[PDB]
Amino acid sequence: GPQEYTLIKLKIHLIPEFLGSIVKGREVFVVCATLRPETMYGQTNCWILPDGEYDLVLAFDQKIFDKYEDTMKECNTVYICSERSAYNMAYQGIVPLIHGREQGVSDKLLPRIVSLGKVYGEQLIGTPLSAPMTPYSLIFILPMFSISMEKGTGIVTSVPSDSPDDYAALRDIKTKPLLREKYSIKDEWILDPLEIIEVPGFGFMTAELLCNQYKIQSQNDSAKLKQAKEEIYKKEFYEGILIRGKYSGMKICDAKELIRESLIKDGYALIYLE
Amino acid sequence: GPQEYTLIKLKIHLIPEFLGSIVKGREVFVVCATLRPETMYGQTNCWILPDGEYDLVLAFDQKIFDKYEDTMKECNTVYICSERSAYNMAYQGIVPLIHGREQGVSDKLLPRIVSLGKVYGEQLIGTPLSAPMTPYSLIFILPMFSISMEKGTGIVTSVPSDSPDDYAALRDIKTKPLLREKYSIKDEWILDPLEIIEVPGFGFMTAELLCNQYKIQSQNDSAKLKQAKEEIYKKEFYEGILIRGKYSGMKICDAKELIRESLIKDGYALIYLE
Ligand SMILES: CCOc1ccc(Cl)c2c1[B@-]1(O[C@@H]3[C@H](O1)[C@@H](COP(=O)([O-])[O-])O[C@H]3n1cnc3c(N)ncnc31)O[C@@H]2CN
Ligand SMILES: CCOc1ccc(Cl)c2c1[B@-]1(O[C@@H]3[C@H](O1)[C@@H](COP(=O)([O-])[O-])O[C@H]3n1cnc3c(N)ncnc31)O[C@@H]2CN
Numbered sequence: 001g002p003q004e005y006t007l008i009k010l011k012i013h014l015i016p017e018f019l020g021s022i023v024k025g026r027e028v029f030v031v032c033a034t035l036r037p038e039t040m041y042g043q044t045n046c047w048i049l050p051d052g053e054y055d056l057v058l059a060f061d062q063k064i065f066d067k068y069e070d071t072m073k074e075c076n077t078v079y080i081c082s083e084r085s086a087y088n089m090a091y092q093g094i095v096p097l098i099h100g101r102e103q104g105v106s107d108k109l110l111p112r113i114v115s116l117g118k119v120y121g122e123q124l125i126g127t128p129l130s131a132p133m134t135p136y137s138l139i140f141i142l143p144m145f146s147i148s149m150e151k152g153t154g155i156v157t158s159v160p161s162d163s164p165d166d167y168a169a170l171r172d173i174k175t176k177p178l179l180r181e182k183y184s185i186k187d188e189w190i191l192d193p194l195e196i197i198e199v200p201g202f203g204f205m206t207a208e209l210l211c212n213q214y215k216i217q218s219q220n221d222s223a224k225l226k227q228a229k230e231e232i233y234k235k236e237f238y239e240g241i242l243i244r245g246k247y248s249g250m251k252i253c254d255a256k257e258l259i260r261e262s263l264i265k266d267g268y269a270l271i272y273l274e
Numbered sequence: 275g276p277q278e279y280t281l282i283k284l285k286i287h288l289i290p291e292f293l294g295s296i297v298k299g300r301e302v303f304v305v306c307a308t309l310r311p312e313t314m315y316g317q318t319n320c321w322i323l324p325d326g327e328y329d330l331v332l333a334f335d336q337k338i339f340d341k342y343e344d345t346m347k348e349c350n351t352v353y354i355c356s357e358r359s360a361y362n363m364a365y366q367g368i369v370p371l372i373h374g375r376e377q378g379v380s381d382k383l384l385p386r387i388v389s390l391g392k393v394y395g396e397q398l399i400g401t402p403l404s405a406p407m408t409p410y411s412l413i414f415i416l417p418m419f420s421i422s423m424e425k426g427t428g429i430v431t432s433v434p435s436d437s438p439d440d441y442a443a444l445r446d447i448k449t450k451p452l453l454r455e456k457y458s459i460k461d462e463w464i465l466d467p468l469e470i471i472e473v474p475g476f477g478f479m480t481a482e483l484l485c486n487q488y489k490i491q492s493q494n495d496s497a498k499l500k501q502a503k504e505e506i507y508k509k510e511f512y513e514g515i516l517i518r519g520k521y522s523g524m525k526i527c528d529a530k531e532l533i534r535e536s537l538i539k540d541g542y543a544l545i546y547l548e
Contacts, residue, residue, distance in 0.1 A: 002361065004338070004383040087276065091365045091547060107511035109278040111547060237381035273365060273385060
């Protein structure tokens with residue numbers, strides 16, 4: 001590193017009781033790291049690690065505070081993310097830090113994030129979200145088992161048309177009916193992929209082709225997925241043509257940063273480094 | 275961590291040729307991390323690791339830039355510090371980042387610091403510096419061998435009256451005449467300690483007493499130094515009375531943050547986390 005990402009804010013549309021008691025009326029967002037802001041037009045769902053443990057982090061609504069109470073008064077926004085990502089967010093001014101009282105005495109200043117609580121990925125499966133740019137009104141949180149808690153926020157947005165991982169993990173849900181009974185996954189949470197990008201070689205549903213081309217059978221086949229992902233990434237950046245949005249018609253390489261800046265302008269996204 | 279520090283900017287008063295060719299007319303500062311902003315009244319010298327390798331980092335004069343040339347135009351300030359500290363500075367907005375061209379292709383953004391070059395601590399020994407708050411007009415860079423390159427910036431300010439390390443390392447220079455011949459250390463670079471803080475138990479030159487009390491013989495006796503340092507730190511914060519500056523008369527615990535904020539206001543210091 002360091003590597004640069006776009007942090008995508010997915011707004012919880014209906015906050016459940018178990019969070020509502022802790023967040024007390026604040027806006028809550030699930031926050032995902034992506035390398036591909038231009039693909040937000042094709043989001044079908046959101047991915048979380050079922051046994052991942054995530055923080056409920058107090059965030060700026062968009063200086064290190066001395067009082068917990070003043071931060072709590074001044075921030076009306078919570079981000080669900082890995083503790084680890086929250087610290088990176090803090091260094092970079094995205095969430096507040098306070099001078100913590102949890103250890104030591106007043107002769108040292110120990111900056112800490114304000115974490116209201118802890119939440120397991122499992123508990124969030126089924127949560128409705130307003131996401132930017134996708135035509136779907138609401139998309140839903142679903143389990144992905146390939147998620148590393150040591151990268152990004154541990155939360156990942158799903159664009160199955162142009163991500164081999166996302167295609168593979170949604171297919172595992174679509175086929176394996178034990179998986180759906182287990183996590184109590186309703187049918188209406190599983191949304192259809194969307195055509196968003198033309199790749200002149202492969203057409204408009206490039207992730208499925210590549211998953212067939214590498215003979216990928218589930219989300220777990222990581223060595224092959226890695227090869228699919230590296231191929232799709234470069235070919236789509238240089239040769240992919242957007243068929244959605246303001247920059248419809250343009251190549252990804254020419255539109256990507258413009259799309260990213262409009263998401264940032266509109267409050268859907270932030271620049272993030274780790 | 276994370277731990278909070280004050281970054282002290284020590285301005286090079288006479289920039290030598292070997293740096294002048296690389297920095298090309300820019301203001302240069304040597305940057306030190308301290309836990310004790312209130313002790314800047316007693317600075318006698320600055321400490322560097324002789325075989326430490328430091329960056330010449332482009333800094334804001336006080337958004338990730340796409341062009342090296344625009345950063346170079348917009349920044350007239352260089353900070354000498356460890357590469358590692360510079361990255362922390364970058365995350366925290368203290369020095370610019372650029373989208374680097376050193377590896378890969380334009381499909382990924384790789385934020386990098388702008389390092390003009392490399393410099394060994396040895397090469398800086400004898401450099402004259404304007405430091406804040408000390409009565410001395412100029413203080414000088416000298417070698418300290420206990421410095422860890424994995425902490426702070428690898429550069430440390432020297433307050434021998436109230437730091438056991440600083441007292442011990444200056445004494446090693448004062449006594450050991452081979453050490454002075456080796457690094458070519460002139461006499462006029464070795465400045466006398468200054469009384470700055472009364473500790474009701476020990477008086478006004480508390481570091482020397484403690485070095486005697488722990489029977490500390492050189493800067494290398496780290497296990498004992500650790501005990502001296504932990505004792506002096508807490509006793510001075512809670513019981514130490516300043517005899518210098520605007521808050522002369524006051525206890526350190528009441529003056530410390532006020533002093534720190536005035537250094538920040540006046541452009542001598544910055545808040546720094548690692
Ligand atoms: C690798 C190509 O990634 C692609 C390719 C196509 C598309 Cl359409 C996308 C992405 B990408 O998914 C996120 C993020 O961008 C990408 C970050 O990859 P890097 O190795 O951590 O640098 O991996 C995914 N990611 C982020 N955090 C993750 C985590 N904790 N665990 C597993 N995967 C994660 O976003 C879109 C929609 N998913
Ligand atoms: C430990 C008490 O430190 C004292 C005690 C008294 C006084 Cl008057 C001072 C400090 B203190 O010296 C710096 C800095 O503050 C302190 C940081 O200690 P922590 O363990 O890295 O958190 O250690 C020192 N330090 C910073 N970076 C260092 C490094 N890379 N290597 C060795 N020591 C370093 O500042 C003043 C003037 N020197």
